[PDB]
């Protein structure tokens, strides 16, 4: 109980401290300095705090910077991956072979040319042929091209 109460009374005191900025690391320098873009304007180089291994501040990660004399003092949860954001914007509906129906030979061909090179890159090596890297899908609109690409 006493620890709880003391925690509250020090809470009132330590909540008046300046809030810490959040900036995205773009590149890590030597001598314990990191290039950080602080939201929404400003690109600084901040000395890392002596509690964070600079090896963990890999580019494109959110980090807290102390209010006065910006000092990376915490690695916040990583920002949404740019690819994740791009795919969320595009919103290609998720697909699977069971949702696909009526084009089984086409499933087989796309399976060969996509599945096998990445899963079994030894069949092609034994055959002596370069792994296929380009697929083109003929067909009128809405016949399952994007569906099959997403499913594979």
């Amino acid at each position: 109980l006493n620890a709880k109460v003391r925690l509250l009374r020090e809470e009132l005191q330590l909540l008046q401290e300046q809030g810490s900025y959040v900036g995205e690391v773009v590149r890590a320098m030597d001598k314990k300095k990191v290039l950080v873009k602080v939201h929404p304007e400003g690109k600084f180089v901040v000395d890392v705090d002596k509690n964070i291994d600079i090896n963990d501040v890999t580019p494109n990660c959110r980090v807290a910077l102390r209010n006065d004399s910006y000092t990376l003092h915490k690695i916040l949860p990583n920002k949404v991956d740019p690819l994740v954001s791009l795919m969320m914007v595009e919103k290609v509906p998720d697909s699977t072979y069971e949702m696909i129906g009526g084009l089984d030979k086409q499933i087989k061909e796309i399976k060969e040319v996509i599945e096998l090179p990445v899963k079994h890159p030894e069949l092609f090596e034994a055959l002596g042929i370069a792994q296929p890297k380009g697929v083109l899908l003929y067909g009128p609109p809405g016949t399952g091209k994007t569906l099959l690409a997403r499913a594979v």
């Binding site: 380009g134 083109l136 003929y138």
Partner: peptide, 8 residues
């Protein structure tokens, strides 16, 4: 184009 599939 290593393969051309047809979706008729």
């Amino acid at each position: 184009i290593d393969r051309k599939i047809e979706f008729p």
